[PDB]
Protein backbone atom coordinates (compact mmCIF):
# COMPACT_ATOMS: atom_id res chain seq x y z
CA UNK A 1 0.00 0.00 0.00
CA UNK A 2 2.03 2.90 -1.38
CA UNK A 3 5.72 1.95 -1.33
CA UNK A 4 6.33 5.72 -1.55
CA UNK A 5 5.11 6.50 1.94
CA UNK A 6 8.08 4.81 3.70
CA UNK A 7 10.59 5.97 1.06
CA UNK A 8 9.35 9.56 1.16
CA UNK A 9 9.72 9.51 4.93
CA UNK A 10 13.26 8.22 4.78
CA UNK A 11 14.23 10.86 2.21
CA UNK A 12 13.04 13.67 4.47
CA UNK A 13 14.55 12.27 7.67
CA UNK A 14 17.91 11.53 6.07
CA UNK A 15 18.00 14.88 4.28
CA UNK A 16 17.13 16.61 7.54
CA UNK A 17 19.60 14.56 9.56
CA UNK A 18 22.23 15.48 6.96
CA UNK A 19 21.38 19.19 7.31
CA UNK A 20 20.97 19.17 11.10
CA UNK A 21 24.44 17.65 11.53
CA UNK A 22 26.19 20.83 10.32
CA UNK A 23 25.01 22.33 13.63
CA UNK A 24 27.31 20.82 16.28
CA UNK A 25 24.67 21.64 18.92
CA UNK A 26 21.58 20.13 17.21
CA UNK A 27 19.53 17.58 19.08
CA UNK A 28 20.14 15.15 16.20
CA UNK A 29 23.49 14.45 17.87
CA UNK A 30 21.76 13.08 21.04
CA UNK A 31 20.72 9.83 19.33
CA UNK A 32 24.11 8.05 19.61
CA UNK A 33 23.30 6.71 23.05
CA UNK A 34 26.02 4.03 23.11
CA UNK A 35 28.76 6.72 23.01
CA UNK A 36 29.99 7.99 26.38
CA UNK A 37 31.03 11.33 24.81
CA UNK A 38 31.10 12.47 21.17
CA UNK A 39 34.68 13.17 20.12
CA UNK A 40 35.43 14.99 16.90
CA UNK A 41 36.46 11.77 15.16
CA UNK A 42 32.95 10.45 15.79
CA UNK A 43 31.50 13.55 14.16
CA UNK A 44 33.56 13.15 11.00
CA UNK A 45 32.40 9.57 10.41
CA UNK A 46 28.81 10.45 11.34
CA UNK A 47 28.72 13.26 8.75
CA UNK A 48 30.02 10.82 6.09
CA UNK A 49 27.59 8.10 7.13
CA UNK A 50 24.64 10.47 7.06
CA UNK A 51 25.53 11.71 3.58
CA UNK A 52 25.63 8.15 2.33
CA UNK A 53 22.26 7.39 3.91
CA UNK A 54 20.74 10.40 2.15
CA UNK A 55 22.07 9.18 -1.21
CA UNK A 56 20.52 5.76 -0.59
CA UNK A 57 17.26 7.33 0.53
CA UNK A 58 17.39 9.60 -2.51
CA UNK A 59 17.74 6.68 -4.90
CA UNK A 60 15.14 4.52 -3.15
CA UNK A 61 12.56 7.28 -3.52
CA UNK A 62 13.16 7.65 -7.28
CA UNK A 63 12.87 3.84 -7.67
CA UNK A 64 9.51 3.64 -5.92
CA UNK A 65 8.37 6.00 -8.66
CA UNK B 1 35.22 26.57 -6.04
CA UNK B 2 37.07 23.31 -5.15
CA UNK B 3 38.28 23.81 -1.56
CA UNK B 4 41.69 22.66 -0.26
CA UNK B 5 41.18 22.79 3.49
CA UNK B 6 38.21 20.55 2.70
CA UNK B 7 40.41 18.01 0.89
CA UNK B 8 42.52 17.73 4.03
CA UNK B 9 39.45 17.23 6.23
CA UNK B 10 38.17 14.68 3.73
CA UNK B 11 41.56 12.98 3.70
CA UNK B 12 41.30 12.64 7.48
CA UNK B 13 37.69 11.48 7.12
CA UNK B 14 38.63 8.84 4.53
CA UNK B 15 41.33 7.49 6.89
CA UNK B 16 38.90 6.78 9.71
CA UNK B 17 37.09 4.52 7.27
CA UNK B 18 40.11 3.00 5.54
CA UNK B 19 41.74 1.24 8.48
CA UNK B 20 43.75 -0.81 5.95
CA UNK B 21 45.47 2.16 4.47
CA UNK B 22 45.12 0.37 1.13
CA UNK B 23 43.26 3.39 -0.26
CA UNK B 24 39.92 1.60 -0.36
CA UNK B 25 36.69 1.52 1.68
CA UNK B 26 34.97 -1.86 1.68
CA UNK B 27 31.60 -2.72 3.15
CA UNK B 28 33.35 -4.56 6.02
CA UNK B 29 35.21 -1.39 7.01
CA UNK B 30 32.03 0.65 6.64
CA UNK B 31 30.10 -1.67 8.95
CA UNK B 32 33.05 -1.62 11.32
CA UNK B 33 32.65 2.14 11.65
CA UNK B 34 28.88 2.04 11.88
CA UNK B 35 28.87 -0.73 14.51
CA UNK B 36 31.38 1.20 16.60
CA UNK B 37 28.87 4.07 16.66
CA UNK B 38 26.13 1.81 18.00
CA UNK B 39 24.45 0.95 14.68
CA UNK B 40 23.64 -2.58 13.49
CA UNK B 41 23.43 -2.29 9.69
CA UNK B 42 22.66 -5.11 7.27
CA UNK B 43 24.89 -5.83 4.26
CA UNK B 44 21.96 -4.77 2.09
CA UNK B 45 22.32 -1.37 3.75
CA UNK B 46 26.10 -1.45 3.51
CA UNK B 47 26.07 -2.47 -0.14
CA UNK B 48 23.51 0.19 -1.03
CA UNK B 49 25.75 2.75 0.68
CA UNK B 50 28.77 1.61 -1.30
CA UNK B 51 26.82 1.41 -4.56
CA UNK B 52 25.76 5.07 -4.23
CA UNK B 53 29.40 6.19 -4.01
CA UNK B 54 31.20 3.46 -6.01
CA UNK B 55 31.06 5.27 -9.34
CA UNK B 56 33.22 2.76 -11.27
CA UNK B 57 31.33 -0.32 -10.04
CA UNK B 58 34.35 -2.24 -8.73
CA UNK B 59 32.51 -2.65 -5.39
CA UNK B 60 34.70 -0.44 -3.19
CA UNK B 61 35.19 3.27 -2.59
CA UNK B 62 38.50 4.92 -3.32
CA UNK B 63 39.43 8.43 -2.23
CA UNK B 64 38.45 10.28 -5.45
CA UNK B 65 35.04 8.61 -5.19
CA UNK B 66 34.86 9.81 -1.58
CA UNK B 67 35.76 13.30 -2.77
CA UNK B 68 33.01 13.29 -5.38
CA UNK B 69 30.56 12.16 -2.74
CA UNK B 70 31.52 14.88 -0.22
CA UNK B 71 31.93 17.49 -3.00
CA UNK B 72 28.29 17.21 -4.09
CA UNK B 73 25.72 19.84 -3.13
CA UNK B 74 21.93 19.70 -2.97
CA UNK B 75 18.19 20.23 -7.97
CA UNK B 76 17.38 17.57 -5.38
CA UNK B 77 14.96 20.06 -3.85
CA UNK B 78 12.12 18.90 -6.11
CA UNK B 79 12.51 15.30 -4.92
CA UNK B 80 12.36 16.41 -1.28
CA UNK B 81 9.37 18.63 -2.06
CA UNK B 82 7.64 15.65 -3.70
CA UNK B 83 8.54 13.57 -0.64
CA UNK B 84 6.66 16.03 1.57
CA UNK B 85 3.67 16.06 -0.79
CA UNK B 86 3.12 12.36 -0.06
CA UNK B 87 1.95 13.55 3.38
CA UNK B 88 0.20 16.80 2.47
CA UNK B 89 -3.31 15.36 2.53
CA UNK B 90 -5.00 18.72 1.85
CA UNK B 91 -2.55 19.57 -0.92
CA UNK B 92 -2.30 23.00 0.73
CA UNK B 93 1.49 23.02 1.09
CA UNK B 94 1.07 22.50 4.83
CA UNK B 95 1.40 19.60 7.24
CA UNK B 96 0.18 19.77 10.82
CA UNK B 97 2.89 19.53 13.46
CA UNK B 98 0.97 16.65 15.00
CA UNK B 99 0.93 14.76 11.70
CA UNK B 100 4.55 15.65 10.95
CA UNK B 101 5.69 14.31 14.32
CA UNK B 102 3.53 11.22 13.82
CA UNK B 103 4.96 10.26 10.44
CA UNK B 104 8.50 11.43 11.26
CA UNK B 105 8.79 9.44 14.52
CA UNK B 106 6.99 6.29 13.36
CA UNK B 107 8.08 5.65 9.78
CA UNK B 108 11.38 5.24 7.98
CA UNK B 109 14.37 6.25 10.11
CA UNK B 110 12.23 7.30 13.12
CA UNK B 111 13.32 10.74 14.27
CA UNK B 112 13.28 11.61 17.94
CA UNK B 113 10.83 14.13 19.39
CA UNK B 114 13.55 16.70 19.93
CA UNK B 115 14.72 16.16 16.36
CA UNK B 116 11.17 16.75 15.14
CA UNK B 117 10.84 19.79 17.44
CA UNK B 118 13.79 21.34 15.61
CA UNK B 119 11.87 20.87 12.38
CA UNK B 120 8.67 22.37 13.79
CA UNK B 121 10.56 25.16 15.57
CA UNK B 122 12.24 25.93 12.26
CA UNK B 123 9.30 26.23 9.85
CA UNK B 124 6.13 27.31 11.66
CA UNK B 125 5.96 30.96 10.52
CA UNK B 126 2.52 31.19 12.13
CA UNK B 127 2.77 29.70 15.62
CA UNK B 128 -0.42 27.65 15.18
CA UNK B 129 1.08 24.24 14.38
CA UNK B 130 0.88 24.52 10.57
CA UNK B 131 4.30 23.47 9.26
CA UNK B 132 5.17 25.27 6.01
CA UNK B 133 7.26 22.50 4.51
CA UNK B 134 8.46 24.60 1.60
CA UNK B 135 10.45 26.49 4.25
CA UNK B 136 12.16 23.21 5.18
CA UNK B 137 12.95 22.33 1.56
CA UNK B 138 14.44 25.82 1.48
CA UNK B 139 16.39 25.59 4.77
CA UNK B 140 18.08 22.33 3.76
CA UNK B 141 19.04 23.90 0.39
CA1 LIG C 1 40.66 -0.58 3.12
CA1 LIG D 1 35.54 2.22 -6.67
B interface mutation test: which of A8, A12, A33 has the most B CBs within 10 A?
A12
CA-derived radius of gyration, chain A: 13
Q: What span, in angstroms and rounded, lies between the C-alpha atoms of A6 and B12?
A: 34
Q: What span, in angstroms and rounded, lies between the C-alpha atoms of B101 and B84?
A: 13
What residues of chain A lie within 8 A of the CB of B52, using their CB?
A: 52, 55-56, 59
Pick the CATH number of B77-139 from 3.40.1160.10, 1.10.238.10, 3.90.1150.10, 1.20.120.450: 1.10.238.10
Domain boundary assignment for chain B: 5-71, 77-139
Contact A51/B69, CB-based, under 8 Å? yes
DSSP labels for B68-125?
Answer: HHHH-----HHHHHHHHHTT-SSSSSEEEHHHHHHHHHHSTT---HHHHHHHHHHS-S
Contact B16/A61, CB-based, under 8 Å? no
**B22/A contact by beta carbon, under 8 A:** no
What fold, for B5-71? Recoverin; domain 1 (1.10.238)
Amino acid sequence: FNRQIPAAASLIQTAWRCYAAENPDSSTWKIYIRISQLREHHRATIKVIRRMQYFVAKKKFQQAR
Amino acid sequence: QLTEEQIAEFKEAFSLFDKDGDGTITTKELGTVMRSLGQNPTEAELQDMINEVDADGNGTIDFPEFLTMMARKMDSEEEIREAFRVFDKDGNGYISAAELRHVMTNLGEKLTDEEVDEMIREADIDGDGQVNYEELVQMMT
